[PDB]
Design a protein around this nucleic acid. Structure first.
Ligand SMILES: [Mg+2]
Ligand SMILES: [Mg+2]
Ligand SMILES: [Mg+2]
Ligand SMILES: [Mg+2]
Ligand SMILES: [Mg+2]
Ligand SMILES: [Mg+2]
Ligand SMILES: [Mg+2]
Ligand SMILES: [Mg+2]
Ligand SMILES: [Mg+2]
Ligand SMILES: [Mg+2]
Ligand SMILES: [Mg+2]
Ligand SMILES: [Mg+2]
Ligand SMILES: [Mg+2]
Ligand SMILES: [Mg+2]
Ligand SMILES: [Mg+2]
Ligand SMILES: [Mg+2]
Ligand SMILES: [Mg+2]
Ligand SMILES: [Mg+2]
Ligand SMILES: [Mg+2]
Ligand SMILES: [Mg+2]
Ligand SMILES: [Mg+2]
Ligand SMILES: [Zn+2]
Ligand SMILES: [Zn+2]
Lengths: 25, 102, 81, 130, 129, 229
RNA sequence: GGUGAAAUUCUUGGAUUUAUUGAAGACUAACUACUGCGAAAGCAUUUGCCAAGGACGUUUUCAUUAAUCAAGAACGAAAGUUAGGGGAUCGAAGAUGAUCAGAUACCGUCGUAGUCUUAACCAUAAACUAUGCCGACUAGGGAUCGGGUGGUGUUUUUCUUAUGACCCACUCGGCACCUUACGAGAAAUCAAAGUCUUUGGGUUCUGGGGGGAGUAUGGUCGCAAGGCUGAAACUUAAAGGAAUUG
């Protein structure tokens, strides 16, 4: 990927992880 | 590798420059790196001056010229033959191409 | 210019160089004995005078200040100090 | 198409450089000359040599050409070089016996301390648009 | 002056259309409104020089039947932001006005030019043909 | 042709008939300050009882070339807009509306390596004509310059434009429309501006552009007849 | 209308044009350049106020008050976020019309959020000269901008001084540019990237093979987006720079 896209995909994964964490808490 | 010393942009001391739009692909490009051409032409071509001159009430009327500055994007101009690739040693020749009309 | 006498170089050269850069620092400005058209009083004025120097007896603008060297009045006559 | 490649040019140049006084204008004469003063395997090659040497003869009779340098044309050089006007252009003769210069070179002459006839005349400091 | 009836040509030429449209000195009322694209069917040659020439001949005939004798030339481009250059057909339209009997005078260009006033169609990166 | 859907939002036959037979011509006359006073001829639909043709006439604007009203070709670049306000019948009489340059001269004067000076002013005339006057200038290469450019510092520009404002205000506030136009036609204001600004910076191609009218008072017929004939 | 072609779309209730006008917001063309300023982001219609600044001139004043700086701060492009005012163009999402094997992509019409503003956030960009700052020295060339010097200089003109604008020479400071190496570099190139094995003028901040990864975790800032800080297990023999020939 472009490093730009890798960063964006990682950001979306972080967003999903934070949503799951907020649901769990 | 540094393609050009002047970065092919020609600012060197302004941080940022206002951008202007291409006339062919409507790309926003900085005004300094905008490879501009002044297109001074007549409203009629050389093949029509005769008919207009003979179809004119004014005998000595001289037809006026149309003026406009053209700001290209770089890709359109490389495509539209107005700007030409050069050999590496000939890149640095800043002077405009020598007038063929000598 | 591999060999030259920096201690005593040619006078035109030092006069050419900028001040604060000669062999010894010496200012280029000077003072002037100026005579006002009105009276016979003689007054001393700096070359690049910054204020409008006037005769003590009478209010007349001997010099008009500018960016560099002060400008004398038309009637006044000056002599180098 | 007939361009007379390397070998005929070299041979002709060497022959003229070496044997100028004994080459002529006629083709067949030069053919026999090149036959006697050069070893040439095939007759066609010698014919080409003769042709280009005749061309060189015509060129040299028109005027001296580059590259080639025989001793006799040095005599034409001697004649042209040795010519000289009897009266010098510089020797204070033309321009009505006047050396026309400006003040600074006059000061130069005086500083050197020698007597020269001068004619001082300042030049306007004006610089035109050119 | 032999009492020439004067008008203005008001030639508007885009890259996709050519407008030959004479009107009076005031310009308020319109004598002829035949369009360059009218004279052709392919719809890709609306701005083709032949279409402009034919529409211009139509305008010249309409003028000579109306009474118009002389015309002032008003060449126009699309103006605004789209383009600043005359349409490819308007030149042949002017030529056809020329070689059609009608007298011509006062040729000028009236392309509306903005003072860099608004955003231009295309976006940042523009057309990507 | 006929690349049409005819999606019309309907008669069997539409009588376009003759649009031009119900139309009549009218000759236009210029104010006396212009030399070749005759202007041209405009067409308009013939009179009807409900709507007066003169009503539609008063309010028309006509563009003319100044050389056409002068005869000389030293004024081919100028562009005078006149206003149709009063009609005598088969002849209509006009009042001054505005001035302009044809775009050709305008872009011709704007060259590179010289900074243009643009000035504006809004001003009431002697009687009531609220006008706005523009002024263009171009810095001139001296007759000796090796300096390729002829740029001017912003302070020079500001003093020059202050002088322009003073000159234009003085010229306009004093005179009326007829006097103002009679001044513009020989463009002596150009000479006055050049003379005043020759002290500050050498100036070239000074002109007066786009004489734009903002407001005109209540119409006076006698004055209009005075400006005519 | 629009295009390579088309179609979506608007139209004899007369669209498109033509003329006048008026409304609303936008931006400041041409001028505009190896030109200016600002710490950087950035800054371009006019003139009035307000304060600020660089440079120059200074036989003016104080006498080390200095440089760089962990900690802490002030600004900080665009996008984004809140609320309130705008609402023209342009326009992510979308709605679609076409190409295409597929095309929710390139092209064409519309079109919300934003684009523009007022307070509050955000603090990231290829925020690039991919060159930290302050000093001294080392090589020539013109130009260019600002300042200051001289010209029995040139025109100007107010009769003439004085200006101003120019011409010549010099000087200070700035953006740069040209040639060259005598030095530098792995070079491409550099007049600083030189004065570095003949290794030391003062200083902050970073990197130690490539991934894993600017990820996990932990703090802290933030309303949120996210920012700052920031690993390792494991895996790999290269990844990469510059130029050369194909
Ligand atoms: Mg590359
Ligand atoms: Mg700076
Ligand atoms: Mg392309
Ligand atoms: Mg689109
Ligand atoms: Mg309509
Ligand atoms: Mg502007
Ligand atoms: Mg400037
Ligand atoms: Mg710190
Ligand atoms: Mg912003
Ligand atoms: Mg809102
Ligand atoms: Mg879409
Ligand atoms: Mg679709
Ligand atoms: Mg749209
Ligand atoms: Mg960063
Ligand atoms: Mg960096
Ligand atoms: Mg930095
Ligand atoms: Mg590692
Ligand atoms: Mg990584
Ligand atoms: Mg955490
Ligand atoms: Mg890399
Ligand atoms: Mg490589
Ligand atoms: Zn383009
Ligand atoms: Zn006194």
């Amino acid at each position: 990927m472009r490093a730009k896209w890798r960063k964006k995909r990682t950001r979306r994964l972080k967003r999903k992880r934070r949503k799951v964490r907020a649901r769990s808490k | 590798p540094k393609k050009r010393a002047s970065n092919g942009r020609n600012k060197k001391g302004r941080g940022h420059v206002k951008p202007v739009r291409c006339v062919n692909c409507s790309r926003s490009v900085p005004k300094d790196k905008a490879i501009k051409r002044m297109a001074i032409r007549n409203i009629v071509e050389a093949a029509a001056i005769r008919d207009l001159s003979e179809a004119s009430v004014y005998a000595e009327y001289a037809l006026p010229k149309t003026y406009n500055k053209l700001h290209y994007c770089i890709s359109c101009a490389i495509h539209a033959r107005i700007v030409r690739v050069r050999s590496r040693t000939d890149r640095r020749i800043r002077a405009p191409p020598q007038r063929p009309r000598f | 210019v591999l060999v030259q006498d920096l201690l005593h170089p040619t006078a035109a050269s030092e006069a050419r160089k900028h001040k604060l850069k000669t062999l010894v620092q010496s200012p280029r400005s000077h003072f002037l004995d100026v005579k006002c058209p009105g009276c016979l009083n003689i007054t001393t004025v700096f070359s690049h005078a910054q204020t409008a120097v006037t005769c003590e007896s009478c209010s007349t603008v001997l010099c008009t200040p500018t960016g560099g060297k002060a400008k004398l009045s038309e009637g006044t006559s000056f002599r180098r100090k | 198409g007939r361009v007379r490649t390397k070998t005929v040019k070299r041979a002709s140049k060497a022959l003229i450089e070496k044997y100028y006084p004994k080459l002529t204008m006629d083709f067949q004469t030069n053919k026999r000359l090149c036959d006697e003063i050069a070893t040439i395997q095939s007759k066609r090659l010698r014919n080409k040599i003769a042709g280009y040497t005749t061309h060189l003869m015509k060129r040299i009779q028109k005027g001296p050409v580059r590259g080639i340098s025989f001793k006799l044309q040095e005599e034409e050089r001697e004649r042209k070089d040795q010519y000289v006007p009897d009266v010098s252009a510089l020797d204070l003769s033309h321009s009505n016996d006047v050396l026309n210069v400006d003040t600074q070179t006059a000061e130069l002459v005086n500083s050197l301390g020698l007597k020269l006839p001068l004619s001082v005349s300042s030049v306007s400091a004006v610089r035109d648009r050119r | 002056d032999n009492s020439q009836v004067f008008g203005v040509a008001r030639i508007f030429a885009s890259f996709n259309d050519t407008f030959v449209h004479v009107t009076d000195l005031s310009g308020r009322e319109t004598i002829a409104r035949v369009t360059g694209g009218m004279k052709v069917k392919a719809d890709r040659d609306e701005s083709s020089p032949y279409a402009a020439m034919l529409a211009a001949q139509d305008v010249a005939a309409k003028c000579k039947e109306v009474g118009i004798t002389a015309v002032h030339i008003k060449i126009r481009a699309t103006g605004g932001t789209r383009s600043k250059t005359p349409g490819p057909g308007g030149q042949a339209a002017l030529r056809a006005l020329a070689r059609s009997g009608l007298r011509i005078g006062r040729i000028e260009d009236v392309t509306p030019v903005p003072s860099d006033s608004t955003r231009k169609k295309g976006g940042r990166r523009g057309r990507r043909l | 042709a006929v690349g049409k859907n005819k999606r019309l939002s309907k008669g069997l036959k539409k009588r376009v008939v003759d649009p031009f037979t119900r139309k009549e011509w009218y000759d236009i006359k210029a104010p006396s300050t212009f030399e070749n006073r005759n202007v041209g001829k405009t067409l308009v639909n013939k009179s009807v009882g409900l709507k007066n043709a003169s009503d539609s006439l008063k309010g028309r604007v006509v563009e003319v070339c100044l050389a056409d009203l002068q005869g000389s070709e030293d004024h081919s670049f100028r562009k005078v807009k006149l206003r149709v306000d009063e009609v005598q019948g088969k002849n209509l009489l006009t009042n001054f509306h505005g001035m302009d340059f044809t775009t050709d001269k305008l872009r011709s004067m704007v060259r590179k390596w010289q900074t243009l000076i643009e000035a504006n002013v809004t001003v009431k005339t002697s009687d009531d004509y609220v006008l706005r006057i523009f002024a263009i200038a171009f810095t001139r290469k001296q007759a000796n310059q090796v300096k390729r450019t002829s740029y001017a510092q912003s302070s020079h520009i500001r003093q020059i434009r202050k002088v322009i404002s003073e000159i234009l205000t003085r010229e306009v506030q004093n005179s009326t429309l007829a006097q103002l136009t009679s001044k513009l036609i020989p463009e002596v204001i150009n000479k006055e501006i050049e003379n005043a600004t020759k002290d500050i910076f050498p100036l070239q191609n000074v002109h007066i552009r786009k004489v734009k009218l903002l407001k005109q008072p209540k119409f006076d017929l006698g004055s209009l007849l005075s400006l005519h004939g």
